[PDB]
Design a protein around this motif. Structure first.
Motif, mmCIF file in Angstrom:
data_model
loop_
_atom_site.group_PDB
_atom_site.id
_atom_site.type_symbol
_atom_site.label_atom_id
_atom_site.label_comp_id
_atom_site.label_asym_id
_atom_site.label_seq_id
_atom_site.Cartn_x
_atom_site.Cartn_y
_atom_site.Cartn_z
ATOM 1 N N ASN A 15 0.817 -1.206 0.000
ATOM 2 C CA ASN A 15 0.000 0.000 0.000
ATOM 3 C C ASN A 15 0.860 1.268 0.000
ATOM 4 O O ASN A 15 0.465 2.283 -0.598
ATOM 5 C CB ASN A 15 -0.955 -0.040 1.189
ATOM 6 C CG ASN A 15 -2.137 -0.984 0.953
ATOM 7 O OD1 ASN A 15 -3.064 -0.650 0.217
ATOM 8 N ND2 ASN A 15 -2.094 -2.172 1.562
ATOM 9 N N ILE A 18 1.810 1.897 -3.549
ATOM 10 C CA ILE A 18 0.670 2.467 -4.264
ATOM 11 C C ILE A 18 0.600 3.970 -4.022
ATOM 12 O O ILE A 18 0.438 4.761 -4.959
ATOM 13 C CB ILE A 18 -0.638 1.771 -3.851
ATOM 14 C CG1 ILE A 18 -0.583 0.271 -4.191
ATOM 15 C CG2 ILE A 18 -1.869 2.460 -4.531
ATOM 16 C CD1 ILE A 18 -0.969 -0.073 -5.607
ATOM 17 N N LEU A 51 4.418 1.536 -9.204
ATOM 18 C CA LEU A 51 3.332 0.582 -9.357
ATOM 19 C C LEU A 51 3.864 -0.803 -9.705
ATOM 20 O O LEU A 51 3.334 -1.806 -9.219
ATOM 21 C CB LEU A 51 2.336 1.070 -10.412
ATOM 22 C CG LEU A 51 0.954 0.420 -10.421
ATOM 23 C CD1 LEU A 51 0.317 0.352 -9.035
ATOM 24 C CD2 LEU A 51 0.055 1.175 -11.378
ATOM 25 N N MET A 55 3.274 -4.316 -7.512
ATOM 26 C CA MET A 55 2.858 -5.612 -8.038
ATOM 27 C C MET A 55 3.907 -6.692 -7.801
ATOM 28 O O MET A 55 3.561 -7.877 -7.745
ATOM 29 C CB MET A 55 2.533 -5.515 -9.533
ATOM 30 C CG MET A 55 1.297 -4.669 -9.860
ATOM 31 S SD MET A 55 -0.189 -5.195 -8.954
ATOM 32 C CE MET A 55 -0.327 -6.877 -9.579
ATOM 33 N N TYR A 58 2.777 -7.678 -4.483
ATOM 34 C CA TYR A 58 1.566 -8.457 -4.699
ATOM 35 C C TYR A 58 1.889 -9.918 -4.983
ATOM 36 O O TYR A 58 1.366 -10.821 -4.326
ATOM 37 C CB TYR A 58 0.783 -7.848 -5.870
ATOM 38 C CG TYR A 58 -0.560 -8.468 -6.168
ATOM 39 C CD1 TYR A 58 -0.657 -9.728 -6.766
ATOM 40 C CD2 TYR A 58 -1.734 -7.779 -5.896
ATOM 41 C CE1 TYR A 58 -1.891 -10.287 -7.069
ATOM 42 C CE2 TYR A 58 -2.980 -8.336 -6.202
ATOM 43 C CZ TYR A 58 -3.046 -9.595 -6.782
ATOM 44 O OH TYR A 58 -4.263 -10.155 -7.078
ATOM 45 N N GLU A 59 2.725 -10.169 -5.994
ATOM 46 C CA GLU A 59 2.921 -11.553 -6.408
ATOM 47 C C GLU A 59 3.761 -12.320 -5.394
ATOM 48 O O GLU A 59 3.531 -13.515 -5.181
ATOM 49 C CB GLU A 59 3.543 -11.615 -7.804
ATOM 50 C CG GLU A 59 2.661 -11.000 -8.943
ATOM 51 C CD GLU A 59 1.242 -11.629 -9.123
ATOM 52 O OE1 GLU A 59 0.445 -11.087 -9.938
ATOM 53 O OE2 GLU A 59 0.905 -12.645 -8.463
ATOM 54 N N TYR A 62 1.440 -13.581 -2.591
ATOM 55 C CA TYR A 62 0.700 -14.780 -2.989
ATOM 56 C C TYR A 62 1.620 -15.993 -3.156
ATOM 57 O O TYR A 62 1.222 -17.118 -2.837
ATOM 58 C CB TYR A 62 -0.117 -14.501 -4.264
ATOM 59 C CG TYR A 62 -1.356 -13.707 -3.922
ATOM 60 C CD1 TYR A 62 -2.390 -14.281 -3.186
ATOM 61 C CD2 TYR A 62 -1.456 -12.357 -4.242
ATOM 62 C CE1 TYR A 62 -3.507 -13.550 -2.824
ATOM 63 C CE2 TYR A 62 -2.581 -11.622 -3.893
ATOM 64 C CZ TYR A 62 -3.592 -12.215 -3.187
ATOM 65 O OH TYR A 62 -4.680 -11.472 -2.809
ATOM 66 N N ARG A 67 -2.250 -13.296 1.434
ATOM 67 C CA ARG A 67 -3.275 -12.553 0.712
ATOM 68 C C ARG A 67 -2.996 -11.053 0.787
ATOM 69 O O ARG A 67 -2.413 -10.570 1.765
ATOM 70 C CB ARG A 67 -4.655 -12.843 1.310
ATOM 71 C CG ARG A 67 -5.817 -12.361 0.506
ATOM 72 C CD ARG A 67 -6.890 -11.870 1.432
ATOM 73 N NE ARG A 67 -8.234 -12.203 0.979
ATOM 74 C CZ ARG A 67 -8.945 -11.478 0.116
ATOM 75 N NH1 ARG A 67 -8.442 -10.365 -0.431
ATOM 76 N NH2 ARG A 67 -10.166 -11.875 -0.207
ATOM 77 N N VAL A 68 -3.447 -10.311 -0.236
ATOM 78 C CA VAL A 68 -3.294 -8.856 -0.298
ATOM 79 C C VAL A 68 -4.618 -8.201 0.063
ATOM 80 O O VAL A 68 -5.671 -8.590 -0.459
ATOM 81 C CB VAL A 68 -2.827 -8.400 -1.690
ATOM 82 C CG1 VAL A 68 -2.943 -6.863 -1.839
ATOM 83 C CG2 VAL A 68 -1.405 -8.839 -1.953
ATOM 84 N N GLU A 69 -4.568 -7.199 0.946
ATOM 85 C CA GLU A 69 -5.708 -6.337 1.240
ATOM 86 C C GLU A 69 -5.327 -4.900 0.909
ATOM 87 O O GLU A 69 -4.383 -4.356 1.488
ATOM 88 C CB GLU A 69 -6.148 -6.440 2.704
ATOM 89 C CG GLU A 69 -7.331 -5.536 3.017
ATOM 90 C CD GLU A 69 -7.927 -5.757 4.415
ATOM 91 O OE1 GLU A 69 -7.303 -6.452 5.244
ATOM 92 O OE2 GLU A 69 -9.030 -5.237 4.676
ATOM 93 N N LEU A 70 -6.065 -4.292 -0.021
ATOM 94 C CA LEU A 70 -5.813 -2.922 -0.433
ATOM 95 C C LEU A 70 -6.505 -1.952 0.516
ATOM 96 O O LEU A 70 -7.658 -2.155 0.901
ATOM 97 C CB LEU A 70 -6.314 -2.714 -1.869
ATOM 98 C CG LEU A 70 -5.676 -3.635 -2.916
ATOM 99 C CD1 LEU A 70 -6.357 -3.466 -4.285
ATOM 100 C CD2 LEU A 70 -4.167 -3.371 -3.020
ATOM 101 N N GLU A 71 -5.801 -0.895 0.896
ATOM 102 C CA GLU A 71 -6.325 0.083 1.837
ATOM 103 C C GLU A 71 -6.614 1.387 1.106
ATOM 104 O O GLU A 71 -6.217 1.571 -0.045
ATOM 105 C CB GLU A 71 -5.337 0.317 2.991
ATOM 106 C CG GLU A 71 -5.033 -0.931 3.823
ATOM 107 C CD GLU A 71 -6.245 -1.428 4.639
ATOM 108 O OE1 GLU A 71 -7.219 -0.663 4.816
ATOM 109 O OE2 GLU A 71 -6.220 -2.593 5.101
#
Lengths: 143, 143
Positions: A15, A18, A51, A55, A58-59, A62, A67-71
Motif C-alpha cells: 500500500n 501504491i 506501481l 505488483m 503483490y505476487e 501470494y 493474501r493482499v488487502e488494499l487500503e
C-alpha cells in the motif's frame, strides 16, 4: 509459510508503494500545470516504476501463501514551491520508503525469513539508486 | 478553453477511473486468494485498462488547458460471495461508470463543448463493450 507479522508488513508496504506511485503522479500534475513537461514525464515514469514495485509485492505475497488487502489511498499534495521544492519532497518521501523497507528487513531477519530478506534486498538497491537519482537532479539544478 | 464545470466533471471522472482500476485490482486479490488465477488475470488486465483510461482523461484535461487534482481513493471491498458475485459487482460498477460518463456528455452538450463530446464517445463505446464482456462472462458461468 510467511508469518502473519511479515505478511502484514509486506501488505503495508504494498500500500505504501501504491501511495508513492500516486504521489509521483500528483507531482506530475503540478509539473504539467506549470508547463514542465520533461519533469512531468520523469514523474510519470517514476509513478509507473512504483506501481511495478507494488505488483512485485503483490505476487510475492501470494507466492508465500498470503493474501493482499488494499487500503484507502490518502490524497497527496498537489502543489509545491517550484521544481526544487517538489524534488526535495520526493527525496524525503523516498528516504521514508527506504526506512520502511529496512524495518521489514529487520523483522525478516528476526524471524529468519531468509526468502523475504533476499526479496527485499532488490528493493533496497533500487531505492538507493532512486534516492541517488533525485539527489543528482537536485544537484544539477542548484542555484 | 474548457469551462471549470466541464473540467471539474472530467477531473471527477479521472478519479472515478482510478478507483475503478483499484476496485478491479481488489477483485484480483480475492480471485488470487481463492486460487482463480485466470479470473485474477482478467481483473488485473481490466485494472490496467482503467488506469490507461484515467491517463487519457489526464492528458485531455491538460490539452484543453486545465489541471488535474488527484483525490483520496476509498478502500474497495476485498471479498465477494463467489466468482459470479464478484462479476455482478463489476457489472453494476461499470453501469455506474457508464452513467457518470453520460452525465458528462450531457453537460458537454449543454455547453456546446463539441471536443469533449467527441472525446467521451470513445469511452461510451469502450464501456458498453466492457459491460457486454462482463455479461458474456456471467452468462458463460450461469448455474
Amino acid at each position: 509459510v510467511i508469518s502473519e507479522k511479515v505478511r502484514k508488513a509486506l501488505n503495508d508496504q504494498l500500500n505504501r508503494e501504491i501511495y508513492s506511485s500516486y504521489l509521483y503522479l500528483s507531482m506530475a500534475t503540478y509539473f504539467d500545470a506549470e508547463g514542465f513537461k520533461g519533469f512531468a514525464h520523469w514523474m510519470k515514469k517514476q509513478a509507473q516504476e512504483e506501481l511495478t514495485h507494488a505488483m512485485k509485492f503483490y505476487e510475492y505475497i501470494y507466492e508465500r501463501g498470503g493474501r493482499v488487502e488494499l487500503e484507502a489511498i490518502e490524497k497527496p499534495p498537489s502543489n509545491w514551491n517550484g521544481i526544487k521544492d517538489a524534488f526535495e519532497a520526493a527525496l524525503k518521501h523516498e528516504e521514508f520508503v527506504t526506512q520502511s523497507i529496512y524495518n521489514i528487513l529487520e523483522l525478516a531477519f528476526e524471524e529468519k525469513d531468509h526468502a523475504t530478506v533476499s526479496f527485499l534486498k532488490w528493493f533496497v538497491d533500487e531505492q538507493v539508486e532512486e534516492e541517488d537519482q533525485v539527489r543528482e537532479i537536485l544537484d544539477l539544478l542548484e542555484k
